Amino acid sequence: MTYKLILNGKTRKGVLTVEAVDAATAEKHFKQHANDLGVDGEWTYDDATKTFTVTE
Ligand SMILES: [Cl-]
Ligand SMILES: [Cl-]
Ligand SMILES: [Zn+2]
Ligand SMILES: [Zn+2]
Incomplete structure (x- = not known):
């Protein structure tokens, strides 16, 4: 399946997929x-969106 990563870092923001x-x-x-990426x-x-979030 395709998963997504939301990066809500303080200094570095993004959305990745794999x-x-x-x-x-x-x-x-x-x-x-x-x-x-530090x-x-x-x-x-x-689960519904297959999306992890990392929050700094
Ligand atoms: Cl797949
Ligand atoms: Cl990736
Ligand atoms: Zn797959
Ligand atoms: Zn990757």
Whole structure:
């Protein structure tokens, strides 16, 4: 499925997407992104939209 990441960092904002066999495979992908972009935040997920948000 296609998942989405909303990055609500203080200094760095974005929306990323990735296709993954399951949410966890997708989420590990997106956490690596947030880590490499230096965005650390609280994580939440919305199932209906398949969209994670990282909030700094
Ligand atoms: Cl798919
Ligand atoms: Cl991506
Ligand atoms: Zn898929
Ligand atoms: Zn990616």
